RNA sequence: UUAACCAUUGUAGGCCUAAAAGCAGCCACCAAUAAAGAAAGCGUUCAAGCUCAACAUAAAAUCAAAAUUCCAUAAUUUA
């Protein structure tokens, strides 16, 4: 029931790892199949930009999540409550 | 709820709690497994 | 949904073993066998071939087939219609290395389950393991006399097994 | 200490934390209780020590954050229950979700309370001199505390 | 990178042909009132049931052990033997015969290419149904059991002990003691064994 | 059935009860005993050589995160990469740390964190790596070194051209 | 199928099995045999560990 | 019947007196 | 030890079994895979199918002294 899920982060900088783990959970074959409406995409960059997660819904609601100080579980917790709408 | 002298988990989903002064095993999958001490 | 089967090309309609399973999903069994029969014509008839039919959400047939099975061929190579009923010490197959290597080379050509292992050592050992699974002992090389003596021993043993079958049949009759 | 702020866009901001008093009296102690020589010298009455391990709404903090050993984590947890039941933590009361008010039933004063008052049944057959049923006071977990009495503390009243 | 060790090798343990427990013929006060002097050694097997009290095992218990133990043991890998005699002591209202057992006796012995954990459950279950208190002990556990007992005596911090007071008649205590108490030293009372008593 | 003991006997039992010796300080509260010399199991030493071998053999080492994609789908990627004669390597990170701590490559330690996969080959078909990466969109690339030169994904893209 | 000792020992039965195509070493290494520091050694020991775990897990 | 604290001590005191009696009868 | 995750493939492997494919039956009990039992419990027209062990990343650490009507009052620390 999710239109699209976008995650961006800086690999070589030693910073938040929750976003990377959160991407792994998002990039799960079971999860991807269940929410078949979404095509998961992962991208990387070098700039001093804190990791940012962008979620797109068909209704137009956009949920942006930064792992800067959020743990991976809290990321998923926010999603599920938002997914329920 | 069967009240038994010794309580034993009966399946994977069975879990244990301490309610109102006694030990309970409660199973979400199978209500038959509910037990009290 | 992918459905496995080891059916032989010669007979394309097993029926109860697969038809109702396929029917439970809901398909035309005759259509399944006919395309299987098309593959039967391409292959020599009466030899098992692994199949990987996929029943799509559209309820269509997507047949995928592979080379002849190792287990049946090893039985065929050993000339065993029905394999040894114990296989712990009952050996009905005595295979030379040259036969083992040649057949293994043919084996490593399917992609479905990735028999693409570069070293033939893997494939040869894989078929040797199948031989161990079956009542077959993989000899390095055998003499024709040993096969004749072994065949004579097997015939005597099979005669004893037939006597054992007669004893079992007599016991079954009593039961 | 990080707090989550929502806007949807939500982000967590890390804030500076108050620092522990430096130079513990007993360095090389694993548990924070033993780096200050408090192994057997605290009870439910010591709100100042107990409060440090408590969430703002009265819950115990996880062991992996406090760093306490299991033996002392259980003692702190039990002491906190007794402290809550004694009304010594008026500012760590449970949060009221919505449309809920405190029971308004008058509060009975209690201390050294082992069990939750809700689930303890009355002793209707108290028993005679030698079969007397005992009313438990205190916690067994604190049986090793330093005692300044001639005889050990009377747990069963 | 989970670490691992070579699996314990029981290859040395041969399997007796008659692995299953044999049958027991139903027909062929101090007997249970003291420490045992028989069957206390493991011998061939590594796992056995330890009698922690004094009791009589009549034919009914023998069958329960027989049937339960026989069913689950694997002939290829497990075997068992009996460590106590068949019922021989008369009982009258000569109704039946009961085999006496003393605290410390090994009622039944098991062995084979199996770990204790595998045989823990059934032996404990079988023990629970025995008339006297019992337990399932491996070779290590019984050794540890004795070692702890000896360790307790050495490191005891109580100056006074039952043996010294009893033997020396301190306090005039032997007025209230039985002649057998001097030998037992307070460990054994009636048919009961007190492990915590040094 | 227990038979009541004479009170004098019961007094004797009470006074002769075992008393254990009590230490002044709990062993847990005390500093932990120093670890004895450890034993290397035949998993790190052999794998250590494998890490040594892959670095020695492969001039270019590029790192990408493990995607937890179905092994049935890993095979085709491995088969697709095998057709391009590019190999995949996966190793435990913790035993990879000591070499990466002291080796020619030491700034790649942040990359070698968590589930990961290694792009190893003998030829710098770096442009084709993107094509193999483009085959599966969701799989990302974290960085690494190509032709013994450490660079990030954005730099790799420019290097690929 | 072929049932001739001469053909069995001098011809390849399985090279070609299609209609158009006509008919044309020790025991598994023990932990002692396996080299202690070889991958072969540890991959069979791991299998032995699985065997032990399954054996223990049976009763629970 | 649990044995009282005072009862246990008074027996120990007497035992110590008799314990000394052993020493003085040994010479 | 018990906390996250995953489960591919030689092969539906010898066998009376209609069919039993790890898991009716009985048989031995090796292969590839960086990583996975010729299977440990589930499920079984039969199978597909639910997990445990495989791999990876993941934190901790032996037993405890019913029937007339309740029945002293009470009490945890001053040497
Ligand atoms: S008081 Fe030292 S371990 Fe907790
Ligand atoms: Zn249940």
Q: What is the DSSP string of B1-37?
A: -EE-SS----STT-EEEEETTEEEEE-SS-GGG-EE-
Placement of tokens 């000591």 in the chain: F98
Q: Least CA distance to F154: which residue of chain A?
A: A45
Instruction: Give the residue from chain F lying closest to A15, CA to CA.
Output: F110
Phi, psi of C147 (to 5 degrees): -60, -45
Collapsed DSSP state (helix, strand, coil) of residue F72:
helix
Specify the long-range contacts of residues D81-87, CB closer than 8 Å, at least 24 apart. Answer: D81/D113, D82/D44, D82/D111, D82/D112, D82/D113, D82/D114, D82/D139, D83/D44, D83/D45, D83/D47, D83/D50, D84/D58, D85/D110, D85/D111, D85/D113, D85/D116, D85/D117, D86/D44, D86/D110, D86/D111, D86/D112, D86/D113
Chain D positions in Cβ-Cβ contact with residue B19 (cut-off 8 Å)? 119
Q: CA-CA distance, C157 to C153, in Å (whole number)?
A: 6
Per-residue flag: G54 CB under 7 A of strand I:
yes
Hey, are the CB atoms on F12 and E165 less than 8 Å from each other?
Answer: yes
Note whether F113 contacts A21, CB cutoff 8 Å. Answer: no
**Which residues have a Cβ under 8 Å from the Cβ of E45 and sit 6 or more positions away?**
E79, E80, E81, E109, E110, E111, E112
CB A82 within 8 Å of CB D8: yes
Backbone angles phi, psi at D44, to 5 degrees: -60, -25
Report phi then psi at D81, rounded to 5. Answer: -55, -45
The pair of structure tokens assigned to D4 is 């989550």
Among C6, C97, C22, C8, which Cα is nearest to C60's?
C22
DSSP summary character for residue E171: G
- For chain D, the DSSP string reads -EEEEE--EEEEEE---PPPPSS-SSTT-SSTTGGGT-TT---TT-HHHHHTTB-TTSPBPPHHHH---HHHHHHHHHHHHHHHHTT--TTSPPP--SS-----PPPPP--S--S-GGGPPP-S----SSSPPP-B-S-GGGTTS---SSS----B-
**Which stretches of chain F sit within 8 Å of chain A by CB?**
65-70, 73, 107, 109-111, 113-115, 137-143, 152-155
Q: Distance of alpha carbon G17 from its chain centroid, rounded?
A: 23
Distances (CA, A) of E6 to B34, E119, F39, G48: 42, 21, 15, 8
**What is the Cα–Cα distance from E193 to E53, expressed in whole angstroms?**
6
Look at residues E21, E72, E62 and name the one whose alpha carbon lies nearest to residue E45.
E21
Compute the distance from residue B19 Cα to the ligand 2 centre, in Å: 18
In this complex, the residue with its CA at the shortest distance from the C1' of nucleotide I25 is: C85
- Distance between Cα D120 and ligand 2 center (Å): 28
CA of F106 to C1' of I72 (A): 82
Chain A touching partners, 3 or more CB pairs below 8 A: D, F
Is F10 within 8 Å of H7 when comparing Cβ atoms? no
Distance CA D58, CA D84 (A): 8
User: How far does residue G9's CA lie from ligand 1's centre (Å)?
Assistant: 78
- Looking at C25-116, which runs of residues are DSSP E strands? 51-55, 61-62, 94-95
**DSSP summary character for residue E186:** T
Among residues C56, C93, C59, the alpha carbon closest in space to that of C76 is found at C93
Q: Which residue has the tokens 């040094």?
A: E198
Residue D77 to residue D73: CA distance in whole angstroms: 6
The chains in contact with chain F, meaning 3 or more Cβ pairs closer than 8 Å, are A, C, D, E, G, H
Rounded CA-CA distance C71/D70 in Å is 58
Please give the residue of chain G at the shortest CA–CA distance from E1.
G46
Please tell me the distance from the alpha carbon of residue E123 to that of residue E68, in angstroms, as a whole number.
Answer: 9
Please return the burial class of D33, using the count of CB atoms within 10 Å of its CB with bins 0-12, 13-18 and 19+: buried
- Cβ–Cβ under 8 Å, residues E75 and E85: no
Neighbours of H1 (CB within 10 A): 9
Sign of CA dihedral D47, D48, D51, D56: positive
Helix (H, G, I), strand (E, B) or coil at F117: strand
Ligand 1, residues D34, D76, D144: which to mutate, most atoms within 8 A of Cβ? D34
Q: To the nearest 10°, report the CA torsion of E68, E70, E76, E80.
A: 100
Contact D10, D4 (CB under 8 A): yes
Query: Chain C contacts of F79, Cβ < 8 Å?
Result: 111, 114, 116
Report chain I positions within 7 A of protein CB atoms.
5-16, 18-19, 21, 26-41, 45-49, 51-61, 66, 70-79
Closest alpha carbon to C19 in C42, C1, C3: C3
| Cβ-contact F67, F138 below 8 angstroms | yes
Q: How far apart are CA H15 and CA E102, in angstroms?
A: 34
Tell me how far apart the terminal alpha carbons of chain F are, to the nearest angstrom.
93
D140 touches strand I (CB under 7 A): no
Structure tokens at E28: 């062929």
Among F117, F50, F127, CA closest to F78: F117
Chains B and G touch (3+ CB pairs under 8 A): no
Q: Which two tokens stand for residue A16?
A: 């938040």
SS3 annotation, E25-58:
CCCCCHHHCCECCCCCCCCCCCEEEEECECEEEE
Residue labelled with tokens 């969430």:
D55
CA of C124 to C1' of I25 (A): 30
Both structure tokens of D87: 């009304």
Q: Cα separations (Å) of E122 from E50, E69, E126? A: 14, 7, 6
Q: Which atom of ligand 1 is nearest to the CA of D68?
A: 4
d(CA A17, CA D31): 29
Q: Which of F128, F131, F123, F126 is nearest to F143 (CA)?
A: F126
Give ∠ CA D121-D125-D130 in degrees, rounded to 5: 120
CB of D51 closer than 8 Å to CB of D40: no
DSSP letter assigned to residue E174: G
CA–centroid distance for F137 within its chain: 26
> What's the burial of C39, exposed, middle or buried (CB within 10 Å: 0-12/13-18/19+)?
middle
Sort out which chain F residues have CB atoms less than 8 A from H11's CB and list them.
11-12, 15
Name the β-bridge partners of E99.
E57
Q: How far is CA E50 from the centre of its chain?
A: 2
Q: Answer yes or no: is the C-beta of D29 below 6 A from any ligand 1 atom.
A: yes
CB of F28 closer than 6 A to ligand 1? yes
Q: Which long-range contacts (CB under 8 A, 24 or more apart) does C167-171 make?
A: none
Q: How far apart are CA E86 and CA E27, in angstroms?
A: 9
Spatial CA neighbour of A12 closest among A40, A42, A49: A49
Is F17:F10 a contact under the CB 8 Å cutoff?
A: no
Q: How far is CA F157 from CA E61, F80, F105, F142, in A?
A: 80, 21, 21, 12
The verdict on the CB of residue D24 being under 6 Å from ligand 1 is no
Compute the distance between CA of residue B36 and CA of residue B1 in angstroms, rounded to an integer.
Answer: 6
Distance CA C168, CA C166 (A): 5
**Residues C51, C43: Cα–Cα separation, whole Å:** 13
Residue F43 Cα, gap to closest chain D Cα (Å): 31
Cβ(D110)–Cβ(D85) under 8 Å? yes
Closest CA to F105 of F52, F65, F153, F157: F52
d(CA D75, CA D82): 11
CA dihedral E166, E168, E171, E174 (to 10 degrees): 50
- Identify the three-state secondary structure at position F79: helix
Other beta carbons less than 10 A from residue E138's beta carbon: 20
Measured between beta carbons, the chain E residues lying within 8 angstroms of H18 are 170-171
Distance CA F148, CA C28 (A): 59
From residue D23, alpha-carbon distances to D26, D36, F34 in Å are 8, 10, 24
Query: Is residue G15 a contact partner of residue G24, using CB atoms and an 8 Å limit?
Result: yes
C-alpha–C-alpha distance, residues F9 and E175, integer Å: 10
Distance of CA D90 to the CA centre of its chain: 13
Q: Is the CB of D31 under 6 A from ligand 1?
A: yes
């Amino acid at each position: 029931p999710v239109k699209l899920v976008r995650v961006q982060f800086c690999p070589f900088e030693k910073n938040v790892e929750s976003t990377r783990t959160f991407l792994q959970t998002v990039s799960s074959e079971k999860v991807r199949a269940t929410n078949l409406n979404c095509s998961v995409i992962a991208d990387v960059r070098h700039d001093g930009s804190e990791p940012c997660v962008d979620v797109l819904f068909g209704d137009g609601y956009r949920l942006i999540m930064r792992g800067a100080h959020l743990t991976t579980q809290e990321m998923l917790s926010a999603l599920a409550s938002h997914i329920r709408d | 709820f069967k009240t038994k002298g010794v309580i034993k988990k009966r399946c994977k989903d069975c879990y244990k709690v301490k309610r109102r002064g006694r030990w309970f095993i409660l199973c979400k999958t199978n209500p038959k497994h509910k037990q009290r001490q | 949904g992918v459905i496995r089967s080891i059916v032989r090309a010669g007979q394309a309609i097993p029926g109860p073993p697969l038809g109702p399973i396929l029917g439970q999903r809901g398909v035309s069994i005759n259509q399944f066998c006919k395309e299987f029969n098309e593959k039967t014509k391409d292959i020599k008839e009466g030899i098992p071939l692994p199949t990987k039919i996929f029943i799509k959400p559209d309820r269509t047939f997507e047949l995928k087939i592979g080379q002849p099975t190792v287990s049946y061929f090893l039985k065929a190579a050993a000339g065993i219609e029905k394999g040894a009923r114990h296989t712990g010490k009952e050996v009905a197959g005595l295979v030379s290395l040259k036969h083992v290597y040649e057949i293994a080379c043919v084996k490593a050509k399917d992609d479905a389950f990735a028999m693409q292992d570069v070293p033939l050592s893997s494939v040869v050992r894989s078929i040797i393991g199948s031989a161990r699974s079956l009542g077959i002992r993989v000899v390095k090389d055998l003499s024709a006399e040993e096969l004749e003596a072994f065949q004579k021993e097997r015939a005597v043993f099979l005669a004893a097994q037939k006597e054992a079958d007669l004893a079992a049949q007599a016991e079954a009759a009593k039961k | 200490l990080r707090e989550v702020v929502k806007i949807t866009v939500i982000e967590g901001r890390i804030t500076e934390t108050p620092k522990a008093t430096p130079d513990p009296p007993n360095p090389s102690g694993q548990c924070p209780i033993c780096r200050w020589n408090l192994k057997h010298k605290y009870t439910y009455e010591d709100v100042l020590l107990l409060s440090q391990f408590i969430r703002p709404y009265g819950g115990m903090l996880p062991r992996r954050v406090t760093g306490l050993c299991r033996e002392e984590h259980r003692k702190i947890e039990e002491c906190v229950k007794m402290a809550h039941r004694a009304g010594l933590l008026p500012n760590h009361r449970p949060q009221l979700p919505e449309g809920c008010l405190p029971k308004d039933k008058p509060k009975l004063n209690r201390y050294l309370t082992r069990w939750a008052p809700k689930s303890v049944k009355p002793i209707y057959k108290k028993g005679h001199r030698w079969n007397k049923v005992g009313m438990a006071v205190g916690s067994p977990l604190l049986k090793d505390n330093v005692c300044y009495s001639r005889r050990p503390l009377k747990m069963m009243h | 990178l989970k670490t691992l060790l070579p699996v314990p090798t029981f290859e040395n343990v041969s399997i007796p042909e008659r692995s299953k427990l044999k049958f027991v013929e139903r027909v062929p006060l101090k007997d249970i009132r003291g420490p045992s002097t028989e069957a206390t050694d493991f011998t061939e097997g590594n796992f056995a049931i330890l009698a922690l009290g004094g009791g009589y095992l009549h034919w009914g218990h023998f069958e329960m052990m027989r049937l339960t133990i026989n069913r689950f043991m694997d002939p290829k890998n497990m075997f068992a033997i009996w460590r106590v005699p068949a019922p021989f002591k008369p009982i009258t209202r000569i109704d039946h015969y009961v085999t006496p057992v003393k605290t410390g006796c090994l009622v039944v012995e098991m062995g084979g290419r199996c770990e204790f954990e595998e045989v823990k459950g059934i032996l404990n279950q079988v023990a629970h149904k025995l008339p006297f208190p019992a337990k399932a002990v491996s070779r290590k556990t019984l050794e540890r059991m004795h070692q702890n007992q000896r360790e307790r005596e050495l490191n005891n911090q109580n100056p006074w002990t039952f043996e010294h007071i009893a033997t020396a008649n301190m306090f005039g205590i032997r007025k209230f003691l039985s002649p057998y108490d001097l030998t037992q030293k307070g460990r054994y009372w009636g048919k009961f064994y007190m492990p915590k008593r040094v | 059935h227990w038979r009541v003991m004479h009170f004098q006997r019961q007094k004797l039992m009470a006074i002769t009860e075992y008393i254990p010796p009590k230490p002044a300080i709990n062993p847990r509260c005390l500093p932990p005993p120093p670890k004895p010399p450890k034993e290397e199991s035949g998993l790190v030493r052999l794998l250590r050589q494998d890490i040594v071998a892959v670095f020695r053999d492969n001039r270019m080492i590029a790192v990408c995160q493990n995607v937890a994609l179905s092994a049935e789908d890993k095979l085709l990627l491995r088969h697709q990469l095998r057709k391009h004669k590019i190999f995949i390597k996966v190793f435990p990170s913790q035993v990879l740390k000591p070499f990466l701590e002291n080796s020619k490559y030491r700034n790649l330690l942040p990359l070698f964190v968590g589930h990961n996969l290694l792009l190893v080959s003998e030829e710098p078909k770096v442009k084709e790596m993107v094509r193999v990466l483009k085959s599966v969109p969701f799989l990302p690339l974290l960085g690494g070194c190509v032709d013994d030169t450490i660079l990030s994904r954005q730099g790799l893209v420019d290097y690929a051209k | 199928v072929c049932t001739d000792p001469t053909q069995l020992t001098t011809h390849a039965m399985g090279v070609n099995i299609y209609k158009e195509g006509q008919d044309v070493l020790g025991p598994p290494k023990k932990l002692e045999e396996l080299e202690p520091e070889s991958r072969e050694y540890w991959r069979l020991l791991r299998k032995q560990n699985i065997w032990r775990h399954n054996r223990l897990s049976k009763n629970k | 019947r649990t044995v009282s604290f005072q009862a246990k001590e008074s027996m120990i005191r007497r035992l110590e007196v008799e314990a000394e009696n052993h020493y003085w009868l040994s010479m």
